[PDB]
């Protein structure tokens, strides 16, 4: 019941996460989280299931004050796309050219989306 995030790969093979908790609970809470982890939410659209984020780095003392490692993603822009999985959602970044991340790279993020929402609750 609390909000347990795992590493995953979409139906094609892709990185993705899994998030516990229903589409519009997460949804509604992914800005506060995001936040926490140096996105920012610049635009959303829940019916396209779309989030524009913009990421920067936190600093290592800020990594360590959320409680999680970098993650080894770049600094820039993605595109988030949320899907419903009635008890859980799905989280999957993607580029501006359409590309996931690597899967380590995702692997990493469960720390720090872990630490994000454990920050918020």
């Not at 019941?1 to 995953?8: E, K, L, Y």
């Not at 796309?81 to 970044?93: E, I, K, M, P, T």
């Amino acid at each position: 019941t609390t909000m347990d995030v795992q590493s995953a790969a979409d139906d094609t093979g892709l990185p993705m996460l899994v998030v516990r908790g229903p589409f519009n609970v997460v949804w509604q809470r992914l800005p506060a989280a995001l936040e926490k982890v140096g996105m920012k939410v610049t635009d959303s659209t829940r019916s396209q299931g779309n989030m524009a984020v913009t990421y920067k780095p936190l600093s290592d003392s800020d990594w360590q004050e959320l409680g999680a490692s970098d993650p080894g993603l770049a600094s820039g822009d993605y595109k988030l796309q949320v899907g419903d999985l009635d008890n859980r959602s799905s989280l999957q970044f993607i580029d501006p050219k359409g590309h996931t991340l690597t899967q380590s790279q995702n692997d990493a993020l469960v720390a720090v989306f872990q630490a994000a929402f454990s920050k918020l609750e």
